């Protein structure tokens, strides 16, 4: 950063790493017929077949117009019943499907009812202070008002993510690390920012320029990507 550029010298980035979102997979499936009897109460689940038996019992009792009007009234109100519950079941499914997918980070700044918070004292909080996007400076105003979701540690945000609806907000490299090592926690969305990380040298280091040339050779030859595999995928 330019304050760190003025402070100390900097070679070309050894990695350009952003910040990204982390939340756990909720991991839901849909269980059988038990999830298929859902709009109606078990009383009516008895009442349906206890009404359905009666038509057959009076048709067998007749063996001892008639059937015309009877059968017309039965079909006539069977249609009413199935129209009511196909309306209720289709509108049940459609009010189900309209909720998803409102998980936006633009949707975070408006309200307090989702947790989403930085690793406090990281560069994440620095970036939220430095944020000039209205949504993320409103999230910054959210975090300033009351912390609500602010964690300080990596494991603290992991445990807040496992114990709440907590978007853990931290650097993308530690999220890659953890999601290689923990499949429940996953990176939600993509990067929040793209910013470069450099090697600190004294102010007035020609060592830094050698280090710059060596970084050019290294990332030309991808020797660091071996190190990327061995430290991020383990």
């Amino acid at each position: 950063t330019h304050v760190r550029e003025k402070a100390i010298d900097f070679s070309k980035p050894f990695m350009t790493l952003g910040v990204s979102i982390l939340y756990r997979k909720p991991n839901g499936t849909n269980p059988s017929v038990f999830s298929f009897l859902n709009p109606l109460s078990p009383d009516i689940w008895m009442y349906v077949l206890l009404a359905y038996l009666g038509v057959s019992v009076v048709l067998f009792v007749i063996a001892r117009l008639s059937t015309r009007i009877i059968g017309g009234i039965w079909w006539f109100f069977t249609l009413i019943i199935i129209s009511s519950y196909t309306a209720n079941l289709a509108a049940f499914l459609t009010v189900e499907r309209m909720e998803s997918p409102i998980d936006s980070a633009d949707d975070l700044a408006k309200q307090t009812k989702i947790e989403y918070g930085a690793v406090k004292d990281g560069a994440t909080m620095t970036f939220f202070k430095k944020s000039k996007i209205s949504t993320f400076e409103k999230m910054w105003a959210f975090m300033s008002s009351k912390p609500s979701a602010l964690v300080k540690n990596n494991e603290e945000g992991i445990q807040r993510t496992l114990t709440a609806d907590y978007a853990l907000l931290m650097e993308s490299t530690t999220i890659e690390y953890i999601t290689q090592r923990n499949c429940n926690l996953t990176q939600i969305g993509g990067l929040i920012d793209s910013k470069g990380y450099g090697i600190g040298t004294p102010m007035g280091s020609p060592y830094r320029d050698k280090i710059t040339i060596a970084i050019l050779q290294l990332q030309e030859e991808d020797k660091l990507h071996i190190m990327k595999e061995k430290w991020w995928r383990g």
């Binding site: 009404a51 009076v58 069977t78």
Partner: peptide, 22 residues
């Protein structure tokens, strides 16, 4: 229920009896 009068209507329809003996 909401549909409760309709559930009464469904089973009301069975005792509707017309001539058969003659």
């Amino acid at each position: 229920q909401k549909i409760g009068g309709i559930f009464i209507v469904l089973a009301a329809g069975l005792v509707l009896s017309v001539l058969v003996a003659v």
